[PDB]
UniProtKB/Swiss-Prot annotation, chain B:
Protein name listed in UniProt: Lon protease homolog, mitochondrial
Mutagenesis or variant effect for residue 9 to A: Has low basal, but normal stimulated ATPase activity, and retains peptidase activity
The organism's place on the tree of life at top rank: Eukaryota
Active-site feature positions: 86
Entry note about domains: The Lon N-terminal domains are crucial for the overall structure of the protein, maintaining it in a conformation allowing its proper functioning. The AP-domain (ATP-binding and proteolytic domains) has a closed-ring conformation in the presence of AMP-PNP and its N-terminal entry gate appears closed. Upon ADP binding, it switches to a lock-washer conformation and its N-terminal gate opens.
Organism ancestry: Eukaryota, Metazoa, Chordata, Craniata, Vertebrata
Coiled coil: none
Subcellular location: Mitochondrion matrix
Tissue: Duodenum, heart, lung and liver, but not thymus.
Species name: Homo sapiens
Function according to Swiss-Prot or TrEMBL: ATP-dependent serine protease that mediates the selective degradation of misfolded, unassembled or oxidatively damaged polypeptides as well as certain short-lived regulatory proteins in the mitochondrial matrix. Endogenous substrates include mitochondrial steroidogenic acute regulatory (StAR) protein, DELE1, helicase Twinkle (TWNK) and the large ribosomal subunit protein MRPL32/bL32m. MRPL32/bL32m is protected from degradation by LONP1 when it is bound to a nucleic acid (RNA), but TWNK is not. May also have a chaperone function in the assembly of inner membrane protein complexes.
Family: Belongs to the peptidase S16 family.
Amino acid sequence: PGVVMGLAWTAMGGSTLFVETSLRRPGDKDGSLEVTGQLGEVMKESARIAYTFARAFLMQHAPANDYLVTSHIHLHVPEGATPKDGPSAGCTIVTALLSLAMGRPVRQNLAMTGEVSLTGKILPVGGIKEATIAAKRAGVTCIVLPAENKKDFYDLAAFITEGLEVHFVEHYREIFDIAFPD
Amino acid sequence: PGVVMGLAWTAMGGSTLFVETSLRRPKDGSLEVTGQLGEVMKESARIAYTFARAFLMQHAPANDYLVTSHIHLHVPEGATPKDGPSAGCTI
Amino acid sequence: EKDDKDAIEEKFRERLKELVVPKHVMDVVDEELSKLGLLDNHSSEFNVTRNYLDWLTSIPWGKYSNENLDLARAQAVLEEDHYGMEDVKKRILEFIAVSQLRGSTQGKILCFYGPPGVGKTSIARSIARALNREYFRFSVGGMTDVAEIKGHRRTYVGAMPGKIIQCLKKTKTENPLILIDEVDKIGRGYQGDPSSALLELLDPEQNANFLDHYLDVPVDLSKVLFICTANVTDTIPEPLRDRMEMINVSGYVAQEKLAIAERYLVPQARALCGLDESKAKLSSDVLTLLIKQYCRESGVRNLQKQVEKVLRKSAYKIVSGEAESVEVTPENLQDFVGKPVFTVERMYDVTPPGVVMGLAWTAMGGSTLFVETSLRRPKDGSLEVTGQLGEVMKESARIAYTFARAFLMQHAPANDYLVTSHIHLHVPEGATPKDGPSAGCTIVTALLSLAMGRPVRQNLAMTGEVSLTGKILPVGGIKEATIAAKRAGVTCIVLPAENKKDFYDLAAFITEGLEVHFVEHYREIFDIAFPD
Ligand SMILES: Nc1ncnc2c1ncn2[C@@H]1O[C@H](COP(=O)(O)OP(=O)(O)O)[C@@H](O)[C@H]1O
């Protein structure tokens, strides 16, 4: 729980990244989020946007849950030596925070990517070909992509697409059902 | 509610941008501005926040939403940098 | 081949007979002529020898333009060629008088600085005409290469002498008038620093012998009137400032702009458009309307473009056959220029509490400034400053805030607004960067007006640096600020007492109609801003 596999663009055929969340610390005080790793300014901002939406999404889904409001959460992307940037992992951060807050592991062999706004809308991201190739190399079964990237995904070669269950989403509410079927 | 469409200038012509605000937390309120916003755009948010806080006093005195609550302000497409006081009234 | 070369040698020798060639130059001619004698016409080096020797013969040696030394005639030329510019005209008249006493031509280094469009470049042509000199103009703003000043090496293929050397041939005299433009806009460069070359040009000791890179011989650059133009003096390099004599040209008020447009701008644009006075008519009201609404600069550069546009459309109208004669009345002005560009002279017609009008000065020209204060929130208060404020400007706000708190204790002890409230201070037009302690006293008035809830006296503009104890310090650009204040239609202007010299150096009509107050401490400003 608290670990979600993501997709990243790399010159060496792309790669898949992970997002790890953990409790940093065990009445009006509020929690805080710390982001570690060589994250760029755009990537750091996306974590703040994801953190705000994750808090808001929790009130509607589970008002009694106050894990994301009071607790202090540490977010780390492993392999900190390599620099990371881009809003690609915005939706991955939301799932990691939600999984940690709800204490439920995300669906196995599931990878997601795509920029997310603080209202929950999923925005298209570049490097669809690299992300899809890295997903197959990582041996994932389900891949979540923005709905606006449907043309990019279907423009790829036939032999790098079959065998992959791809989900196209517009809002994070659809990602929540896929990530946490229950 | 909390989302307003604005107008912007780009190299490839005009563009339309949205301004979305949300509650950061469920006694002084604070405003956080996200996105690759420039110094001029960041300052215009402070001016807009001050005026909107003052405008509510003369319009809805009983409404204390802006003075106490914590509001997060984000302009979508965070990868693309933005600057200018053009979006002052949209905020 | 030799016979053709012989004719080339003979014609070149004839040209140098009139010139008083220096001792070290004639030997250079002789050796080049000797090399030309033994070189064939088809040789590549023959062209270089032929061209270089031509340049040496073309440059005058000891030939001086016939200067005019009549004070009355020169003054009449200056008055008929330009309006105003008394300080510039006085220096030129004094220049002629000194030359008369000396009994021979002499040179000087002069600098004209002011807002663009004032007439710095145009007066240079009038001065040369009055002085019976030759006018030459070149610019150094944003220039990084020093080779342009002195040319390139002779052995280099496709190399030409420098602009000063090129100036000598075209002017055909050793006593020309040289104009340098955008001196304040020069900057440091990686390839080379032309500031060192400019220092030698403007140094009376160094310019006596100037070394180029093509002719490779010293040239007497003295006895040459050097005129340089700039927008501001602060950005001019310190060593260059000392060698230059600073003469200030200020902007023009609305009544001054109409006189320039009626007498100079309109006739010049009409003449170059092929029209006549009878066919094309521009009244005073349309010219007044163009200045008030279609222009905002302190100069007349933008006004000239608007006037030229009107004549261009009028010339097209008569050619197309719409009318034999075109009269530009205010009713049909929109058919020529369109909707007015500027509709409001000032952002705040009536200042609410916490709003005080200020004055700002730039290289662009004078400008008006506003300071707005508001309650950011309904143990210790805080002040937030917005806008593109510089480091100096932000610090002045801190000084003003501290003094404003102290002033309220001694004036309204029961009032704790400035200590127990969070106040946001904003200077509108946040896109434009702002810097300088000029608005120090303006910030104090804005904070005091907001705390007391009393609007400041209408049509009042103030400027001047304020100290921690309340002392008012002098500020620069008083002339530019006063012109902008007059354009903004203010009635009362508050200035530091140490700036009295700058304010009274303005023209009589500019000062007239303005209620100026000179202060040394902010206590006097409080009474003026808040009479009750
Ligand atoms: N007092 C004046 N009398 C006559 N013409 C003037 C006067 N002031 C300005 N002008 C006109 O305005 C124009 C100003 O342009 P110029 O001075 O060359 O710009 P800059 O100052 O940037 O070099 C000139 O062409 C000049 O004819």
